[PDB]
């Protein structure tokens, strides 16, 4: 498994993918989405 | 920041997750003193920002207003008894430090905090430090939202908002006494050490100068000269501009490559196979084992989506859990931390958990305290890892076999593994779904040992499965895939 997720701080956690939706947030450089952006939304 | 500067012979700490201070002074007479862990990593003591929605998340501790020391845990008295009584048993405290950033930056302007102090986010506002505008990184950060945008960047990560906190410019003076103040108010409390929170997201060098700041050790407990054990909070799984290595001159680092190999290895995960961790640690291409701090799991990745995924193995997991904990406490590699954790009522849809937010147990806000049961478990959703026999048996091995050599390994070429720690120590395996019949050397002096997994050694007798060692240092190991616990360890303090 594994699976996609990409971490960035305490709650808070992405989806790896190639382009983020319209209400997402996108980090990039991140090595577990293996040239994905990381995509997330914060609690905040 | 390198030696422990646990008691002498305690090789272990265990995060007391979101525990209350009296709870862990309590916690520190009754059980953590005499059990022979070497210290408690606490939740930040400093106040925070008060999140209500979602209810009071175990977060909101990572959104600093102030460096009073006053949070759900307790109060600063509350905090120096706690550390006044856990030195007085022997064992240390580290502080969460969470020292890149303050609250949100989009976060409203008032008293929503666990002190009630003032804040402004918006206006970088922290009177009850203080802190003002010009004590931030807003004219350092060259992303045109302010945030961190790509951790190709380096300077982006460091310089920039975190996920919308509000960066501390740690370059300046005033910024780096601000915080040595409050670890050093800590320190003179009597404080051990720290974790460092959000180390990637700090400059090596702004560590180190603030590192340098700090007083020695309280001598009511720790000899003069004595510097603060660091150990520095750095995911990095490879591939990334910023590598672990940068950060090993300030103290240990947390090697997240640990847990989560481990955990994809004891699931047997993606063609893995314990035979496979014979040349575990460095020849996995860890850290160096003196600057690693390790582990199987912590509170972010326990939930199914920090570092390592759901290849982590939590308490939900408990025997696959308790094999890997095993693992790593009797292995040489690092310095170990054990997890304790409380359940949450997990829910996940579409592979998210939607209620990892949620923060320990409580009563409208105000954290239950830490009940124990009869039978030496914890009530009130503390699930107490830390008080399980094959742990802390396991905690006791480590200490027991601390500065002794990796010996005497074996394999099946599977799944069914075992090795030793010099003449102190042995431990064996069995992860197949066969039954485990070896004759193997254990470099222990012959008698009878009691297995500390299954049982005890309680005073001349064994509560559990007992393992007879000839002369020669040999012994059978007889061990059902169907076993409760797929694992026997057998030490020097075990032996009838
Ligand atoms: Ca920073
Ligand atoms: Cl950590």
């Given at each position: 498994?594994?699976?996609?997720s990409?971490?960035?701080?305490?709650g808070?956690?992405?989806?790896?993918?190639?382009?983020?939706?319209?209400?997402e947030?996108?980090?990039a450089?991140?090595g577990?989405?293996?040239?994905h952006?990381?995509?997330?939304?914060?609690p905040? | 920041?390198?030696?422990?500067?646990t008691?002498?012979?305690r090789?272990?700490?265990v995060?007391?997750?979101?525990?209350?201070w009296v709870?862990?002074?309590?916690?520190?007479?009754?059980?953590?003193?005499?059990?022979?862990?070497?210290?408690?990593?606490?939740?930040?003591?400093?106040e925070?920002?008060?999140?209500?929605?979602p209810?009071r998340?175990?977060?909101?501790?990572?959104?600093?207003?102030?460096?009073?020391?006053?949070?759900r845990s307790?109060?600063?008295?509350?905090f120096?008894?706690?550390?006044?009584?856990?030195?007085?048993?022997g064992?240390?405290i580290?502080?969460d430090?969470?020292?890149?950033?303050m609250?949100?930056?989009?976060?409203?302007?008032?008293?929503?905090?666990t002190?009630?102090?003032?804040?402004?986010?918006?206006?970088?506002?922290?009177?009850?430090?203080?802190?003002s505008?010009?004590?931030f990184?807003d004219?350092?950060?060259?992303?045109?939202?302010?945030?961190?945008?790509?951790?190709?960047?380096p300077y982006?990560?460091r310089?920039?908002?975190?996920?919308?906190?509000?960066?501390?410019?740690?370059?300046?003076?005033y910024?780096?006494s601000?915080?040595?103040?409050?670890?050093?108010?800590?320190?003179?409390?009597?404080?051990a050490?720290?974790?460092?929170?959000?180390?990637?997201?700090?400059?090596?060098?702004?560590?180190?100068?603030?590192?340098?700041?700090?007083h020695?050790?309280?001598?009511?407990?720790?000899?003069a000269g004595?510097?603060?054990?660091?150990?520095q909070?750095?995911?990095?799984?490879?591939?990334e501009?910023?590598?672990s290595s940068?950060?090993?001159?300030?103290?240990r680092?947390?090697?997240?490559?640990?847990g989560?190999?481990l955990?994809?290895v004891?699931?047997?995960?993606?063609?893995?196979?314990m035979?496979?961790?014979?040349?575990?640690?460095?020849?996995?291409?860890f850290?160096?084992?003196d600057?690693?701090?390790v582990?199987?799991?912590?509170?972010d990745?326990?939930?199914?989506?920090?570092?390592?995924?759901?290849?982590?193995?939590t308490?939900?997991?408990?025997?696959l859990?308790?094999?890997?904990?095993?693992?790593?406490?009797?292995?040489?590699?690092g310095?170990?931390?054990?997890?304790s954790?409380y359940?949450?009522?997990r829910?996940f849809?579409?592979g998210?958990?939607?209620?990892?937010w949620?923060?320990?147990?409580?009563?409208?806000?105000?954290?239950?305290?830490?009940?124990?049961?009869?039978?030496?478990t914890?009530?009130?959703?503390?699930?107490?890892?830390?008080?399980?026999?094959?742990?802390?048996?396991m905690?006791?091995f480590?200490?027991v076999?601390?500065?002794q050599?990796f010996?005497?390994w074996?394999?099946?070429?599977?799944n069914?593994?075992?090795?030793?720690?010099?003449?102190?120590?042995?431990?064996?395996f069995?992860?197949?779904?066969?039954?485990?019949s070896?004759t193997?050397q254990?470099?222990?002096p012959?008698?009878?040992?009691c297995?500390?997994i299954?049982?005890?050694?309680?005073?001349?007798?064994?509560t559990?499965?007992?393992?007879?060692?000839?002369?020669?240092?040999?012994?059978?190991?007889?061990?059902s895939?169907?076993?409760?616990?797929?694992?026997?360890?057998?030490?020097?303090?075990?032996?009838?």
């Amino acid at each position: 498994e594994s699976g996609n997720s990409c971490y960035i701080y305490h709650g808070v956690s992405g989806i790896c993918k190639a382009s983020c939706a319209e209400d997402e947030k996108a980090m990039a450089g991140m090595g577990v989405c293996e040239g994905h952006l990381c995509c997330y939304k914060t609690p905040w | 920041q390198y030696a422990p500067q646990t008691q002498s012979g305690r090789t272990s700490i265990v995060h007391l997750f979101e525990w209350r201070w009296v709870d862990i002074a309590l916690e520190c007479e009754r059980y953590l003193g005499p059990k022979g862990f070497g210290g408690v990593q606490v939740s930040p003591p400093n106040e925070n920002v008060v999140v209500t929605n979602p209810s009071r998340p175990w977060w909101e501790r990572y959104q600093p207003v102030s460096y009073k020391l006053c949070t759900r845990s307790g109060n600063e008295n509350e905090f120096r008894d706690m550390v006044t009584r856990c030195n007085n048993v022997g064992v240390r405290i580290y502080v969460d430090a969470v020292i890149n950033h303050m609250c949100g930056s989009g976060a409203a302007a008032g008293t929503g905090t666990t002190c009630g102090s003032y804040c402004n986010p918006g206006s970088r506002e922290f009177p009850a430090v203080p802190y003002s505008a010009w004590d931030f990184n807003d004219g350092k950060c060259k992303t045109a939202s302010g945030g961190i945008e790509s951790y190709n960047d380096p300077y982006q990560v460091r310089d920039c908002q975190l996920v919308g906190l509000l960066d501390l410019a740690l370059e300046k003076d005033y910024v780096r006494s601000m915080i040595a103040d409050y670890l050093n108010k800590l320190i003179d409390i009597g404080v051990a050490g720290f974790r460092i929170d959000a180390s990637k997201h700090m400059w090596p060098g702004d560590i180190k100068a603030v590192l340098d700041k700090l007083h020695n050790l309280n001598t009511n407990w720790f000899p003069a000269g004595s510097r603060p054990f660091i150990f520095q909070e750095v995911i990095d799984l490879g591939g990334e501009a910023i590598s672990s290595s940068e950060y090993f001159g300030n103290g240990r680092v947390t090697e997240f490559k640990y847990g989560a190999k481990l955990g994809t290895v004891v699931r047997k995960w993606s063609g893995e196979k314990m035979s496979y961790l014979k040349n575990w640690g460095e020849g996995w291409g860890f850290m160096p084992s003196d600057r690693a701090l390790v582990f199987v799991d912590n509170h972010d990745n326990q939930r199914g989506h920090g570092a390592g995924g759901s290849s982590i193995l939590t308490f939900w997991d408990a025997r696959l859990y308790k094999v890997a904990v095993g693992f790593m406490l009797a292995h040489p590699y690092g310095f170990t931390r054990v997890m304790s954790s409380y359940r949450w009522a997990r829910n996940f849809v579409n592979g998210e958990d939607v209620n990892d937010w949620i923060g320990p147990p409580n009563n409208n806000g105000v954290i239950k305290e830490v009940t124990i049961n009869a039978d030496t478990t914890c009530g009130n959703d503390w699930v107490c890892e830390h008080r399980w026999r094959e742990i802390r048996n396991m905690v006791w091995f480590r200490n027991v076999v601390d500065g002794q050599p990796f010996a005497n390994w074996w394999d099946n070429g599977s799944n069914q593994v075992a090795f030793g720690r010099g003449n102190r120590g042995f431990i064996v395996f069995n992860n197949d779904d066969w039954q485990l019949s070896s004759t193997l050397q254990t470099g222990l002096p012959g008698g009878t040992y009691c297995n500390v997994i299954s049982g005890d050694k309680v005073g001349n007798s064994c509560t559990g499965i007992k393992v007879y060692v000839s002369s020669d240092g040999t012994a059978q190991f007889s061990i059902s895939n169907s076993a409760q616990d797929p694992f026997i360890a057998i030490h020097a303090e075990s032996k009838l």
